[PDB]
């Protein structure tokens, strides 16, 4: 019979992160197709999703409210700019 | 049957039979008599309706027999004061019984080896006055409303009272001033004594004792019954050689939600007018009159009508709802 169980999934390796003036740079190195999603922590979230497969460099703007980035099965990374 | 953890025990009884004190498995703890009808809530040492393997069986009894608990019969269980009592509920340590006028309460049973054990406690039983009404309806047919009452089911379920050993029952008549000494008259009972004076000033005596050069006010004596159970009463002292050792018994007459039948007041003489309603109220008993507007502003008004009354109420465009006693609300609207 069909029964609800628990599935074990792996977490993708941490990308090379470099900070800049109101922007975040990520060097993504995926072994398998990994999903990258990001949203703003304010009034306008503006959700964007993309399946990363090859070596990619992504530049994301960080607003005053904050930017939440989810890289695969890893816990969401939260970023805030310095005053 | 939360008895997996609980077990029957052996406690002190002041009268096991023929005035002799022993360790009885049917020992009395607390005898509650709060019920005005006459029902007694007896707390005993043993457990009723449960087997040794921790299972519910109404025909079986669980008592303590020399370090190990043993099974007995429900039919063998008896309660008596001066004449036998009718058992109206049994569950664990608790027994419900209606008893006639007596001075001593006796609770007993019969074991597997066909041996009968009984515990006797001195208890003044005389049902006194207890009531808060005249107990009398009421209409046979009327409006159905939700209410609550105490049912007449004697069955050992729901509610329960705490019972313990009488404890050491104090009695000042045991001591007597023999010239300049104090004499303790036992009368075939186990007595626990204590005095302020020198020499022997403590102990548990079975024989007549005399305290040389002492006053009655400087001494204290109590009869030790450990065979019978008694209700955990705040009007009776706690047993000295006992901490928080207590039993429990199921009590009759529990509270249950029922349906109360109420009568509907007679329809008043109604006459209509220009945006107004006239009512000629003729109440037989105090009847409540309430009215509200069926719009934005309800403006609720309430009054208890008792005598012959004429009421003029203004009816707005939205409508007027009038409730006269237990009758369904009368709704009024003006003509265009």
């Amino acid at each position: 019979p069909l029964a609800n169980v628990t599935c074990r999934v792996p977490k993708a390796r941490n990308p090379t992160v470099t900070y800049g003036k109101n922007q975040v740079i990520m060097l993504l190195y995926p072994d398998h197709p990994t999903l990258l999603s990001y949203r703003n922590m304010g009034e306008e979230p503006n959700y964007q999703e993309e399946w990363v497969m090859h070596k990619k460099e992504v530049v994301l703007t960080v607003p005053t409210e904050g930017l939440e980035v989810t890289w695969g099965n890893n816990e969401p990374y939260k970023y805030w700019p310095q005053l | 049957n939360v008895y997996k953890a609980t077990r029957p025990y052996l406690a002190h009884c002041p009268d096991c039979g023929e005035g002799h004190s022993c360790h009885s498995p049917v020992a009395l703890e607390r005898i509650r008599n709060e019920a005005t009808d006459g029902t007694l809530k007896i707390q005993v040492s043993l457990q009723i309706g449960i087997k040794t393997d921790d299972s519910h069986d109404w025909t079986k009894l669980r008592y303590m027999d020399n370090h190990m608990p043993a099974d007995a019969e429900r039919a063998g269980l008896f309660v008596r004061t001066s004449a036998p009592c009718t058992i109206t509920g049994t569950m664990g340590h608790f027994i419900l019984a209606r008893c006639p006028k007596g001075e001593t309460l006796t609770v007993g049973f019969t074991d597997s080896r066909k041996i009968s054990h009984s515990c006797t406690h001195p208890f003044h039983h005389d049902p006194p006055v207890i009531g808060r009404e005249k107990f009398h309806s009421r209409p046979q047919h009327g409006k159905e409303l939700p209410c609550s009452t105490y049912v007449q089911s004697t069955a050992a379920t729901t509610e329960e009272i705490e019972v313990h050993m009488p404890p050491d029952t104090p009695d000042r008549t045991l001591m007597s001033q023999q010239s300049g000494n104090v004499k303790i008259t036992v009368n075939g009972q186990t007595v626990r004594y204590k005095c302020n004076c020198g020499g022997s000033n403590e102990g548990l005596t079975t024989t007549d004792k005399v305290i040389n050069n002492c006053k009655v006010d400087q001494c204290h004596a109590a009869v030790t019954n450990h065979k019978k159970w008694q209700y955990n009463s705040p009007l009776v002292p706690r047993n000295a050689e006992l901490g928080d050792r207590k039993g429990k018994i199921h009590i009759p007459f529990p509270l249950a939600n029922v349906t109360c039948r109420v009568p509907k007041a007679r329809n008043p003489t109604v006459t209509y007018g220009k945006n107004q309603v006239i009512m000629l109220l003729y109440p037989d008993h105090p009847t409540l009159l309430s009215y509200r507007n069926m719009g934005e502003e309800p403006n609720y008004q309430e009054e208890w009508v008792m005598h012959k009354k004429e009421v003029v109420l203004t009816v707005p465009t939205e409508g007027l709802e009038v409730t006269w006693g237990n009758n369904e609300p009368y709704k009024y609207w003006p003509q265009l």
Partner: protein, 250 residues
């Protein structure tokens, strides 16, 4: 229920209070006690005796039957029962008045609502007793006062842990008497049952009728209600195919 056991009378000695974790637990030891009983005294010493008077507050056996529930009303869902005389026959339609829930009766789609007014006779905090609902600003959980509504607070009528604020204080017993005298504020629930007044059923505007289990506002004459009926093409007859009328007088 003020659970009071048998008082521990220590003859020729001193008794000591043990701090117990029980709702409204009160303990006191009285020195120089020398009372008697129906039979007589009970102590040997004249002034060297003590009496331990312990007490605590519990939920009464009636709480399963006689109880008032403190609810927090959030949002309300409207639903209506409508009678329609469709094709010379009365049809019953029961649907939510949101303007989304569609019900098909005799091949005709019915859409009821959305309601013109979002008004409800209930506030954000309500109290329910049997068949009566009251708009009450009841005290929060663990903040009840003695003698008032909420002096004893429990999660459910069958709950284990209870909150109690009744202002229970033990008193010294009478000369040569065994009893536990105490000063305590009377039952807030029993007092409220007498001084509550009229429920929403009698005080609510727009002629609202209040029902229970579940609690709801029935027949509240407020605003209007839009109804969309998708009548099938089979129920229609052409003007040309329908009988024409001439020479009419009224």
């Amino acid at each position: 229920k003020t659970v009071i056991p048998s008082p521990y009378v220590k003859c020729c000695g001193t008794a000591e209070c043990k701090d117990k974790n029980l709702p409204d637990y009160s303990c006191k030891v009285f020195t120089g006690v020398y009372p008697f009983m129906w039979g007589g005294a009970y102590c040997f010493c004249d002034a060297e005796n003590t009496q331990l008077s312990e007490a605590h507050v519990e939920k009464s056996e009636s709480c399963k039957t006689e109880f008032a529930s403190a609810y927090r009303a959030h949002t309300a869902s409207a639903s209506a029962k409508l009678r329609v005389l469709y094709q010379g026959n009365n049809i019953t339609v029961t649907a939510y008045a949101n303007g989304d829930h569609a019900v098909t009766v005799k091949d005709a789609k019915f859409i009821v609502g959305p309601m013109s007014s979002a008004w409800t006779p209930f506030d954000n905090k309500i109290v329910v007793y049997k068949g009566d609902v009251y708009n009450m600003d009841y005290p929060p959980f663990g903040a009840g006062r003695p003698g008032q509504f909420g002096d004893i607070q429990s999660r459910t009528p069958e709950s284990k842990d209870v909150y109690a604020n009744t202002q229970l204080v033990l008193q010294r017993p009478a000369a040569g008497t065994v009893h536990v005298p105490y000063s305590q504020a009377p039952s807030g629930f029993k007092y409220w049952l007498k001084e509550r007044g009229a429920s929403l059923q009698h005080t609510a505007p727009f002629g609202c009728q209040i029902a229970t289990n579940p609690v709801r506002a029935v027949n509240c004459a407020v605003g209007n209600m839009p109804i969309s009926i998708d009548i099938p093409e089979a129920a229609f007859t052409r003007v040309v195919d329908a009988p024409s009328l001439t020479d009419m007088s009224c």
